[PDB]
Design a protein around this ligand. Structure first.
Ligand SMILES: N[C@@H](Cc1c[nH]c[nH+]1)C(=O)O
Ligand SMILES: N[C@@H](Cc1c[nH]c[nH+]1)C(=O)O
Ligand SMILES: N[C@@H](Cc1c[nH]c[nH+]1)C(=O)O
Ligand SMILES: N[C@@H](Cc1c[nH]c[nH+]1)C(=O)O
Ligand SMILES: N[C@@H](Cc1c[nH]c[nH+]1)C(=O)O
Ligand SMILES: N[C@@H](Cc1c[nH]c[nH+]1)C(=O)O
Ligand SMILES: [K+]
Ligand SMILES: [K+]
Ligand SMILES: [K+]
Ligand SMILES: [K+]
Ligand SMILES: [K+]
Lengths: 292, 290, 295, 295, 291, 290
């Protein structure tokens, strides 16, 4: 049988989940009508489903791997625990996308006790519940799967417990963030029961590549020209991951090419200082995978 | 404040819920981006939400009315009971759309379900039914595409919502047991409404009944010889008795009008013609009141 | 040549404009890519364009008729007048759709809020010219923020302090924590025609269409009511449901005591007296549609 | 087994085919992903497919009924005949929708243009087989350019010199600077059935449906007219609006001078005599829909 | 006049065709309504049409080049031959996308097991030719879409269906029995000679197409290793010719080594490279490669 | 407060504007419903609006930066000047996308425009040009489909935006006069920014230059005999001079690397092979700094 991986059918995670699988060498033809997309080059089946189903599919052993936000994973874990079940899974990797936080927020027109008795709208009723029990606060519930941010101005609720990627989003609905109750990111998870030897080996291969993809994010390959005499000064500004590669230029004994891996943001931050030190013809090139 | 009604944002019930509101006199401009559509002529706000949210909004008193399938309503009632809560609501009316049933099905190739993985969108309904019948099974919850699960080797069987027997046969599945029958309902929250809101609900309910009573009925008109009245009346009696109308410069023939269920009309149409009926017209009826 | 009519390509007006033309006997095949849809049964070309173009096409005589909101029409009339031009058109009919109003609104304060409270504010709107005229007439100064869509977001996103916005319902503003302070313009859809006379044949076609437009308008919100009642109750029922002139009375087979009565009624009035009709002995009451009514 | 009917998946005929089945009492849930929609109240399966497949499915007996344009039906019939096969089917009914024609057209020149002007030209079309037969019959040679869509663009894009195009309106060609020169085929929607006899129960179901289809067709374009007039004017009004048979005459409450008159009329004839009805004393004129009419 | 190229209007094939033209230096603005997109930098017109029209446009000389699957090309060639015509074209290049196969499949078993069955397919002409040659009789069911549903919906007994993956059939409870046709995208040209200037433009494009094709699945690998390990690493990752060797700053023990590699071979030897002392290994894209 | 940048919501520029911001280090989550997208890593808000609004938002100081075509910018500048206002803005950079021209065209069948009805989306640019040339004409403003106007008999001629000469010829129109040439620009409002906002703009501009300088350039690598260095250098000089790299166990051949414009590379590629170049690679370059 083939390895089954469940990803979000469409949405935030979906594009990034697909891109990640593609960079890990999985080729597939995705038809928006089909539940499953079959890999053309590897024994892998990609299930594209509603995000909320993914944890359950992993807990129940229906699929082997899943990519899902920690928030959705924990919300569902809690729902199942409170129904008396014992869900389990293996965390393989916390990914570098899907960054967001779950925040209690009130109208700008302030404290945690100010939430006592309020109606609070959320898509994550279970995370909200646990947090309010732990802090001894009573409140009335209003579960909406979408458009939570509109609830207060539409007079459906007094406050919200909303997922945001940016502080500014709340301010732009005249809401003040009061307490962050959960921080999340996309994870790659695996079901509890051991896989067959061949499936596990395939998972291991994929993980090597996942690390390579993750390690390269935000990094670029920098090339420049400088006088040999300036090597030490430039190296101090742009050290590389180990040390600069040094390359001769044709018919030139005074100048060299230097190559270094750098985080893109650090490069821009020292770019003008590199020029002051005599660097010229500076190139930025992409890197798709990095292995330490 | 305005009366809040929650309906399905898009889908099976969404079109019918909107149509029904429109036939009940509610005018509104629906923008697919907004959560709320405000009625332009009445103090009513229509919330367009995911179906699965509607029961919760009614249980928690966030909205006043909802239109939702019995299946989704009961699934969510069960989930809340099993978390120890006590959800309540008022059933106002079982509606004439949204008919479907939840059915256990197996590949063509009840104790036969013991130990199987069963895919469903309604895990809680499935659970209750299998407890009541002492059957153990493994779960596979999918929100869409449950019918694919067996042929894709995700599960051995399904507990699927269907509107037609034939759908299962066309995925090489045999229906084995119907475990739930559902249809659209209009429901209201438990806590009493204000006097003005309740009066508005009452008005709407009079019209809803009118809409429901007229479904499948048509106004039939025809010409016949006066001599044939009795024979035609026996074929098409009307809701009370035929209206009889003179025709210009004619003493031998008349027009007759009667309400009829559309299916009964077609069933007796040829016999009406054999009895001398001609120029037969079928007109729509939008509301009927007893 | 064929008569040209311009309607909104997509949107609020758009569905209703098409429906109206269809009820006036115009059959056509609408392909979402084409500028023009040609009528299959009449010499009429329907141009489907951005709403904002329609007034200009009528002013410049490019098309013969148009269906457009008064608000868009006047905004564009003002823009052209302020560029020194003299736009003109014929108003044929105000239609029973596209109702909305243009309203100054501010963020809610639990207080009486005034027109002077707009002095110095940045005000977002899609109708800068209507806003401008109104604020000159009331001697108020303000800063401008023209957005073609999403005006209601401007205050909460901190792009502006206030808005001048099109609303169909009072409640919409309340639901963005905005208080309607002053209605500056009321609008509905209109059918308009260019200034320069049409050819005799085109004008005759317009006249035909107008007869039907009136028939469509006059029937909106009306229904044909039919019911059974005892003859003895005629006067009491007639007082409750008078009809457009007087009830039609129709015999029932083999019955001298009861009759059928038919009357046209506004749907809302019918529902308002429905229970009283039943108390007076009415039964098997039917509501049927009416597509056109002519006085 | 259930009766199988094939209709166009999306497009021109698609909406009308579905509407027609619905008016014939077939209830179904149509999901845009599925090939088949199953009727919820009758033993009928609706296949929604590409139009070009339908004739083949009927010819090969895969389905029992189909709704398809004559043009597509004949194009496919010809293709199969020229491959040596013998396709057959039963025509049940020609429907009142899908009207269009296939026309040879050229770029406008300031001159009279004719059929011999096509000799040697490259002619773009979606119906190569209908074009071929017509040009053989008229002894004209030409070069082919088959496009499934956008045939109207071929001349201006310099892909071809001329076209043989499907149009619903004369004006569409004029509006691409093409002159219609010869109509080579006229088409409309048809309901067809496969050659091999159906089971008794399936055939009885087909027969039921056909009774309704006729009722639907006979009512198209007809309305139920009601009005008030003085009894004295009956003869004059009857001459203007005779009805299907003769006017129904109905008393009005407490009135011996006026009556209500009801008559079925084609909508167009009604509008054509409407003003004359008013001149003869008609008032409160109503137009009501009719869904089915049976002779 | 400008060079005309026909490509699929929409579908997966459409995107790869556009990407390929873009990597060959053709810039254009594509509006989903227009038949034609005009190149902004070259005298080229791109026609975006239904796939099934492309062979015909080439056969009839309406356009100069086309990108189309072999399956669709041969299906239409056969249809035209059987109507007595003589279609011709030039094959310029078999491309590196659009791989699929046309397979007879039955519900979950031989070729003789197809005798007398109704077989659904979108390629009736390919199916016909194959069954004549093998002396098998069968009844036809032509569907342009959803062929895989035909057996379970009881429209047919079997199918002759295009597939990109073995697993797709197994997931509809169908067993692949015989592959009757293998296909991939091709670049083709009409039969009649082009003008000198158009043919020269085609030739330029072809040089780039080859460069694009030769680079697919290859990456530029860079790493650090001790000078002492050069031979062992070279044996694991030989490069297209031989590793480039580069000094590192203030270091006489270690060097950087660069080599082109097929991506799959790289991953297959990656851990062995690390065992041999490789570190800071980078994978970089390559857009074109020329021999 | 955060820096506000306005870009086209959807359209020609829209994708390129987003790409350019992304290459300048702005990460964001773009939901097609929202007016604003907030940058996740920088204090920047991206407003996605109709193109025609962008100049106004800059002139009125509502936003800090905008990306817009010169054509739309000047059309709106003119409209505002003719209403008596004084719009101003700072041009930061002419970008390398959005190239097009506004051209008077007639049916194939300048004084020839006197008295004609001329359709256009840019009435104000047309007006100014015709005043300057003393020509009278009648107007027909359409926001879309201007090219259809003559064949549909809505106008006699057009003043249309085109990216290619061939587009007009393919509607049987002849280009007669180019009246305006445009490309996308990055512009900024007139009133000074806060020190911190201006510094952020300056950072972004350094990157924008890097992006622009790299467009159409590639990093070329190849093998050649050491003896052929001079001949190859003359064919492919690099931006300064070729990098030269030893190959393993080889004293006769070397690797050479050079930056080149992609078109010049293809133009000399066969001559490089004649001179003994082999294993030639083309790699992308994302930014180049002088
Ligand atoms: N030597 C440079 C670049 C490089 C890494 N790996 C290979 N080359 C660095 O250490 O960053
Ligand atoms: N008298 C007819 C029709 C009718 C009902 N109500 C009014 N008219 C019947 O009893 O069916
Ligand atoms: N006589 C009824 C119904 C009617 C109007 N016109 C024809 N019939 C009324 O006046 O309302
Ligand atoms: N008596 C009218 C209306 C009618 C037809 N059928 C029943 N009523 C006519 O002959 O047209
Ligand atoms: N010399 C290395 C890298 C390279 C190829 N071409 C230029 N450099 C190899 O042969 O793979
Ligand atoms: N030295 C080569 C490549 C290069 C530029 N910058 C760094 N390396 C050139 O001058 O084009
Ligand atoms: K509020
Ligand atoms: K014309
Ligand atoms: K079956
Ligand atoms: K299977
Ligand atoms: K041309």
């Amino acid at each position: 049988t083939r390895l089954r991986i469940a990803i979000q059918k469409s949405g935030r995670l979906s594009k990034e989940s697909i891109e990640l699988l593609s960079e890990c060498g999985v080729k597939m033809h995705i038809h928006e009508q089909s539940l499953i997309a079959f890999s053309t080059n590897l024994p892998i089946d990609i299930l594209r489903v509603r995000d909320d189903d993914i944890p359950g599919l992993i807990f129940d052993g229906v699929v082997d791997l899943g990519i899902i936000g920690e928030n959705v994973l924990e919300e569902n874990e809690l729902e199942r625990q409170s129904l008396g079940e014992n869900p389990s899974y293996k965390l393989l990797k916390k990914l570098d996308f899907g960054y967001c936080r779950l925040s209690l927020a009130l109208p700008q027109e302030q404290n945690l006790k100010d939430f006592e008795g309020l109606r609070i709208a959320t898509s994550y009723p279970q995370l909200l519940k646990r947090f309010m029990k732990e802090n001894g606060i009573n409140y009335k519930n209003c579960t909406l799967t979408g458009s939570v941010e509109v609830a207060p101005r539409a007079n459906l609720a007094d406050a919200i417990c909303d997922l945001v990627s940016s502080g500014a989003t709340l301010q732009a609905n005249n809401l003040k963030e009061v307490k962050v109750i959960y921080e999340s990111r996309a994870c790659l998870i695996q079901k509890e029961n051991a896989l067959s030897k061949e499936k596990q080996a395939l998972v291991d291969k994929i993980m090597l590549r996942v690390a390579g993809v993750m390690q390269a994010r935000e990094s670029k390959y920098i090339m420049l020209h400088a006088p040999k005499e300036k090597l030490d000064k430039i190296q101090a500004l742009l050290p590389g991951v180990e040390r600069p590669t040094i390359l001769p230029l044709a018919h030139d004994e005074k100048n060299v090419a230097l190559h270094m891996v750098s985080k893109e943001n650090l490069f821009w931050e020292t770019m003008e200082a590199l020029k002051e030190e005599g660097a010229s013809s500076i190139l930025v090139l992409p890197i798709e995978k990095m292995l330490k």
